[PDB]
Amino acid sequence: CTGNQQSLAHSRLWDAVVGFLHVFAHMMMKLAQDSSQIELLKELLDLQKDMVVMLLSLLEGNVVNGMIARQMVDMLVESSSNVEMILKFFDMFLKLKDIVGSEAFQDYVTDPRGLISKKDFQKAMDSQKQFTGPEIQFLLSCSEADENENFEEFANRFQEPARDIGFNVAVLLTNLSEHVPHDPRLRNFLELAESILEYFRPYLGRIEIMGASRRIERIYFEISETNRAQWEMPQVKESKRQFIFDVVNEGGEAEKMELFVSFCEDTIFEMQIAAQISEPEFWGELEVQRVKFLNYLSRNFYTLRFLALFLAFAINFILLFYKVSDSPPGDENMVYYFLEESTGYMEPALWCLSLLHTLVAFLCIIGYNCLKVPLVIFKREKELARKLEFDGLYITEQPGDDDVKGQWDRLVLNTPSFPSNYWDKFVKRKVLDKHGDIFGRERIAELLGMDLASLEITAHNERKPDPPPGLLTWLMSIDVKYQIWKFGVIFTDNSFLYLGWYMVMSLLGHYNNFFFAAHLLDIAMGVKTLRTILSSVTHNGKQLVMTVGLLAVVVYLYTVVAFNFFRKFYNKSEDEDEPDMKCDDMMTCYLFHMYVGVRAGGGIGDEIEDPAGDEYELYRVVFDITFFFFVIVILLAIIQGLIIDAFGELRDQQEQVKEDMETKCFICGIGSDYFDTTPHGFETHTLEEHNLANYMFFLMYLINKDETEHTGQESYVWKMYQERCWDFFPAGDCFRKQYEDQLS
Amino acid sequence: MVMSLLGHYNNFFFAAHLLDIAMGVKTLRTILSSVTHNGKQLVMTVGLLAVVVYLYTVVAFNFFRKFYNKSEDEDEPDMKCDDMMTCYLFHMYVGVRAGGGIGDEIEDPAGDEYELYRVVFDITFFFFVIVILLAIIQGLIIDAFG
């Protein structure tokens, strides 16, 4: 609001804040003495947060040189006897936490039992050049010598209260430093503020946005410790690779990054379900047992999946030492048995290993039910909710009546527990609000089920009823339609069916007609390079299958020509007692040209008897030459040439993605060459302005933060996120093209 | 130096110098460097050859034992698939390094049951191991050299 902001610029508020800034710094250092006034210190620092956020809101929407930031630095330099010392309290208190436990000085002979006296660190700090002047004496004075007649108590309590204000003042100085350069009075302060500033470097994310002014402006925020650690886990790290490959490889520009917001949206679900499982620090007592057991599966799912390889390779090593004999050891008397090299442990070992392999496979499928099934259900639930809210896929227009996905989704609409895993439990009530007046709302209640649709007006408005629970409620408190829908989608995806395929040969493997080895082939998909090979065959399935058909027909013409004319030549020797002419029948001849024919160098002519100048000599020699000229050296080379080229293409696509990312900004459309006009310009640019994680962190605390506490720019983003309009992203400018003439 | 000092023994091992001395040529050096340029992918692919052939050996051991028999004037105990080690090595030596796949060396199925089951075995073997997968092994480092 330019009016209110401009009015406050010319008011007496500058005088007020400088008075506050002077008085705040004095009593807080006075109040730190003896720790009696810590409650008041909490209140003062808590109010200082409210002071700084007022200043930040004043700074919102400014020009690079708007004269409000200029007035702000004029206020600040007028407080030059005060803005330094307020920073120095944080400087000392951060630095001592760094210094303690990071040198030779420790507990040592003062008190190993954690009851150190006053002289524990009297002038150990004096060796360091960090503290000088009366500051070291001030720390000694502020050293609460309680029970003089501690490292773990002195520095400990001054971390929780001072966190927020230190981050906020760091934000203010950082934003001011970027907004108005060529202000050397401001440049003095950042040397003093360097320690606290670099401490909050991991927890100061930075975002560029656009909208409402056709201008780029920065945003600053806090990040939780746990979420920063959670994103760095290997599972989410892998999922980043899987998403980022697809959208850059084939996604269009318009649909480039609705998928990206969707990826962020369900990526939140990944940390949530991962946050439930943890290393956490009698019917009633059974629940804790099953919860601990299933969570133990959920953490180490990939590890036991790798264990299946060791079981498979080890059992298949024992599969070699076999023999057969005319009789059992001591005419339809085959006997399969071992040939162990003078050691009897192998035969018991095979039974033991088989039992273990079956068990660990069952562990894989149970853990996969716990872990990834929530995510795929989340995807389908989100698809139905967004499509119903913003479109008429089941109310305005039916589907195409060919896609099974749309038809199978029809059943869950009537159920009451439809948005089980999705966040919002109100989409059913939103669609009737939108498409209520056009269509019959009662019919719409029929489409959604809407159990007690009349009660939906006052389901939880008139009162909040709550009848009690009971035992064995699970046997009659489950929606059968919803569960059937769940099982259908769970069986539809490829990944779960692969585990079931593993299970069928695993259970059948205890029969052990050598079929343990079938696991060993397709288990090796986990290698990326090997997986590309198997994917290459189906990459050109249509073209390949048509080409194999043309092989099947072009050879068939040669067979009928041979059947008419060249019957006498095809004769395998039997010492002149040969009824083995293999072209007295079309099925025999056609199969002969497959087995003995194409899979042989030189074509047919190698195997058939030589034409010894016995009529049709030229007619025969052209037959073999034209056969070899068409089927083998040309057409079979097409069959070879298709997928090998495809394999090269797929490898080139992967390398293309990796090269394309480095040479072009992902979010912003600007190429890397513009940012290559500075040392580390592109690297710093993609590090901070478009980090690709800070945006994901941006969407999180917006969900976590209360609606009343949203700032101006924060609420500006959140409104469009509800409305699903992806315009506020920059898409052409990155705070530098706007201000290229003045300065970055 | 080691082969040089050992060469005074002179069990023909002077010739080992002659191979790797020719690295000084640039064009020749590129050839030797090309093999290790894609070592990871090559080694994984050779592993897939080793396993995809192993499935064919166990299928043959169950069903097609009678066919594998080298002639000894009807005094032949030389059935080379009465033992998995023998059969698996047979598919390496006599098998992959031969045009047309396995079917050239084995006795012809003379309409003696499992005819379609046998003809598909040799065709699918030749269709996967030789004309495709071995061509991948050839195609990797030649592309790397380019």
Next chain:
Amino acid sequence: ELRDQQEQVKEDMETKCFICGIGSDYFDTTPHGFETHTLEEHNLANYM
């Protein structure tokens, strides 16, 4: 080569206006700028 020519035609149409000589990158400076542009201004049927 022939397969590459067919794919070349399909890729060349998307990255360049057919009737007008202007490349698609100029109309890519708006959401759906090229798509709306080729939808209405040069539809290839409306001329017929």
Next chain:
Amino acid sequence: GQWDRLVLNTPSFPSNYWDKFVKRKVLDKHGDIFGRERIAELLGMDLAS
């Protein structure tokens, strides 16, 4: 990195390099933070006094 640890204690470390003063430069730089005597232990510094 592990194999390079041994040469630090030796006196004739910069035998072939030009500068024979890097041992004296690092203690000037990182002297006040860490214990300079411990730094003499890291570099050897025969007769550090």
